[PDB]
Design a protein around this ligand. Structure first.
Ligand code: CA
Ligand code: CA
Length: 859
């Protein structure tokens, strides 16, 4: 049905018009197979997210099954592509993929998170029908979190001349950028050029550096290489040097991007044009003062993020990924750790574009499986690639670990947002057997990485450093000896200091921190940290796992110490699976079924709705915004009254002074409860933070990074006024967060809002419709759980509904879902023809709400 011709881009979108079927028995690799009855889907696609929860599955992977899925796509290849090279590129398939083309088996790929490709040229039927087939075998159990199943990332097709730049074939280095910044910058490039024709070729390269999206006349540097002869069927590595004239640096505030264009010439005619995205920047990790970007000290205010996208499952939709980054940026995040596996390229694209530093992790476990997951990557880590396996992307001369590592580095080596390669996470946690071989495995991975990309330091997240394991010491030394950075998981202040004293050569950071566990909007108790009867957790920041720490504690220990370059809070968003403290590593329901099925670690829930601690972090991290946030909500049936009718009231703010007022119900006269002022601390490197040092300060130091009042319960409004350092009042309404909580009536109406009122009509783009359950005056009912039904009309489709509630087993693909803590989310996707999307949210006894979304055709 689809068509491939000579007028398409060198690399083109191949997502459309696939056939899919779930089956553990069918054998559909033959072109003549009858798939006319199969379901038609556009990639990316997750076939785990549509199946039912089952008690016989595992809690850590969200009780959802995997299974064997088949993808088939029939397409014509035009006559005029004969003599051209064709390859198919997968950015990710989870997992155990097998690829046939026209009935011929090309190879396999085990790992579910690394990119790979296959050459199709040798089996292509030029001027005829062709059939690509992908078998996906996600056998449970393979994951400590929800993985999803299928082709959950973009697929592309690459068509080139016989002489062409190789796949991911250009490497860029600027080794003297730190001292050349502002003048001429030396660029050293290495380009892989393949000659896949029957004749020798004498090729030259013309390479040009110019602003992304601009014209070549705005170039700041160019080189043409001397002619190099490349025999038929051979390849050459062509080195070149470009002097770039005062390039604009890439930074968090100004992520300036450039296109580095390579043209392959033979006989004066351009045979192939290959572009790579680039940014000029350098980093540094100092053992005493931490991280710097472009010579400026910067604190790594980071979060860990799993790959899935909430109700969409594992599908790496670009808008969903971008919305995650946007919400994190508003919190003050400047860095993401891709725990614990390579990101989708789309995430790398967004971070390049938006100015977010990426610590890209490649592996969770190494050669030993975790948590009884007999099908995880540890089964493949140390195995070799079969001689008849034509899979492409990385080095094939050793093990899958080396393949998937180098394949990820090859894809992202030029991305300015990527600052570190993380080689593993808690590699010796949750396993069986001796750990004595792990230093040598670590040193092996370090050697591969240094040879694959010398420009970035490598790292990992080790939680055994705080246990002072001999192996962790040996591995941290080898990291340091190779220019790497040591990441410690779940250290506290005392252990940070112990590392600094015991291993003074190490540059360290908190690779995984906090792991606080909270639900959104739960206030009838201030305690947590363990299973409850209502399958939810308090929203107060008094709840964390036994090996973790509350948010204020894990940040207080980091912000004080300049030698702790930063933190990667677990996690920025909730993710499916690992529903700790209702977690389960084997099969069976945890607690009363239906059991919690997604995480509680997230600062933001799966639907993108922030929890209260979001604004604590925002008060600590976001220097472009003022925060003023109050918890709890002020309804009697949701507050936690200690005897005396006192409710603990917490204020998250970056202001210098806060005055707390109470206005009795229907009074319009506010009465002052009291004021508190923060003390400004300044570290040796120049970082600043605020702590409360009043006479009534909390006995626990880190809890003084915010403000607490005891307020007797009474119907009305709790409001707050913020003042800056000069005592000028911070204007009301200009702060982020709830500066006032009011006793609400019962639910009366719905309030729907599309985050983007116009989206692209490409069948991919999304609009997120946040719906609130409010009373007659528009106040969100804090505990409302009304079932909301979504009617979607026009040039769009409902693709997900969500509320973030872990024990809610209602289908993500239904048109209805209960609200949780007053909110529910609908996700609509455009079609491929412009028009209008009409979405109506309704519920029994409530006033409906309607949003309209325009969709614009692709230019
Ligand atoms: Ca398991
Ligand atoms: Ca601020």
């Amino acid at each position: 049905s689809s068509a491939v011709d000579s007028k398409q881009n060198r690399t083109s979108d191949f997502d459309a018009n696939w056939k899919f079927m779930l089956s553990d028995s069918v054998q559909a690799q033959d072109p003549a197979f009858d798939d006319s009855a199969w379901q038609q889907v556009d990639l990316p696609h997750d076939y785990s997210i549509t199946q039912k929860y089952s008690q016989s599955n595992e809690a850590e992977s969200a009780y959802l099954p995997g299974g064997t899925g088949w993808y088939r796509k029939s397409f014509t290849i035009d006559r005029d592509l004969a003599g051209k090279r064709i390859a198919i590129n997968f950015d990710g398939v989870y997992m155990n993929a097998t690829v046939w083309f026209n009935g011929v088996k090309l190879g396999t790929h085990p790992y579910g998170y690394s990119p790979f490709s296959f050459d199709l040229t040798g089996n292509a039927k030029f001027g005829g029908e062709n059939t690509i087939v992908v078998k996906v075998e996600n056998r449970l159990p393979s994951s400590r979190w929800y993985s999803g199943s299928g082709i959950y990332r973009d697929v592309t097709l690459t068509v080139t001349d016989g002489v062409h730049v190789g796949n991911n074939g250009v490497a860029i280095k600027t080794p003297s950028l730190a001292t050349q910044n502002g003048g001429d910058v030396t660029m050293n490039l290495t380009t892989k050029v393949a000659n896949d024709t029957e004749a020798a070729a004498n090729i030259t390269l013309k390479q040009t550096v110019f602003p992304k999206g601009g014209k070549t006349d705005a170039a700041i540097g160019t080189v043409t290489t001397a002619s190099k002869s490349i025999a038929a069927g051979a390849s050459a590595d062509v080195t070149s040097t470009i002097t770039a004239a005062s390039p604009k640096l890439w930074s968090i505030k100004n992520p300036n991007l450039y296109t580095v264009r390579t043209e392959v010439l033979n006989g004066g005619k351009v045979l192939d044009t290959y572009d790579t995205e680039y940014g000029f920047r350098w980093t540094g990790f100092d053992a005493t003062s931490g991280f710097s970007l472009n010579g400026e000290k910067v604190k790594l205010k980071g979060v860990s993020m799993h790959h899935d996208q909430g109700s969409l499952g594992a599908v790496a939709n670009r808008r969903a990924i971008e919305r995650q980054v946007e919400i994190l940026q508003k919190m003050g995040v400047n860095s993401i750790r891709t725990t614990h596996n390579p990101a989708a390229k789309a995430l790398i694209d967004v971070c390049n574009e938006k100015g977010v530093l990426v610590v890209e992790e490649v592996f969770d476990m190494w050669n030993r499986s975790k948590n009884g997951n007999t099908e995880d990557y540890g089964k493949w880590f140390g195995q070799a690639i079969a001689g008849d396996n034509a899979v492409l992307g990385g080095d094939k001369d050793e093990t899958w670990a080396k393949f998937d590592l180098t394949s990820t580095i090859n894809r992202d080596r030029n991305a300015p947002s990527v600052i570190m390669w993380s080689l593993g996470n808690e590699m010796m946690e949750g396993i069986s057997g001796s750990v004595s071989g792990f230093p040598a495995t670590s040193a092996k991975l370090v050697a591969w990485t240094k040879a694959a990309d010398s420009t970035r330091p490598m790292t990992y997240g080790d939680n055994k450093i705080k246990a002072n394991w001999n192996e962790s010491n040996t591995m941290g030394d080898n990291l340091t000896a190779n220019g790497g950075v040591v990441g410690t998981n779940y250290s506290d202040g005392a252990n940070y200091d112990k590392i600094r004293t015991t291993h003074p050569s190490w540059a360290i950071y908190g690779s995984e921190t906090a792991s606080a566990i909270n639900s959104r909007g739960i206030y009838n108790r201030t305690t947590g940290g363990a299973q409850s009867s209502d399958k939810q957790l308090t929203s107060y920041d008094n709840s964390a796992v036994g090996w973790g720490a509350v948010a204020s504690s894990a940040w207080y220990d980091v912000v004080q110490r300049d030698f702790v370059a930063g933190t990667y809070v677990w996690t920025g968003f909730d993710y499916l699976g690992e529903p700790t403290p209702w977690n389960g590593t084997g099969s069976g329901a945890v607690g009363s079924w239906p059991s919690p099925k997604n995480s509680y670690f997230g600062i933001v829930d799966t639907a993108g709705f922030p929890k209260d601690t979001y604004y604590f972090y925002q008060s600590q991290w976001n220097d472009d915004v003022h925060t003023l946030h109050i918890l709890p909500a002020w309804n009697e049936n949701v507050v936690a009254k200690g005897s005396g009718n006192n409710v603990p009231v917490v204020v998250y703010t970056d202001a210098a002074k806060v005055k707390l007022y109470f206005t009795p119900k229907g009074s319009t006269e506010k009465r002052l409860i009291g004021e508190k002022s923060f003390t400004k601390k300044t570290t040796a490197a120049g970082y600043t933070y605020q702590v409360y040092e009043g006479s009534d300060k909390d006995s626990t130091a880190h809890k003084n990074m915010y403000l607490t009042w005891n307020v007797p319960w009474a119907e009305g409004t709790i409001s707050a006024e913020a003042y800056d350092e000069n005592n000028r009042l911070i204007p009301e309404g200009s702060t982020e967060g709830n500066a006032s909580v009011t006793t609400t009536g019962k639910a009366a109406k719905l309030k729907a809002d599309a985050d983007r009122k116009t989206i692209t009509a490409d069948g991919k783009d999304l609009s997120y419709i946040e719906v609130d359950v409010t009373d007659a005056n528009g106040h969100i009912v804090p505990d409302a759980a009304n079932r909301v039904t979504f009617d979607v009309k026009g040039a769009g489709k409902l693709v997900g509904v969500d509320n973030g509630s872990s024990p809610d087993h209602d289908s993500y693909q239904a048109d209805n879902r209960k609200a949780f803590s007053g909110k529910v989310l609908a996700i609509v996707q455009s079609t491929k023809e412009a028009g209008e999307i009409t979405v109506t949210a309704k519920a029994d006894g409530l006033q409906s709400s309607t949003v309209k979304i325009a969709t614009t055709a692709v230019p």
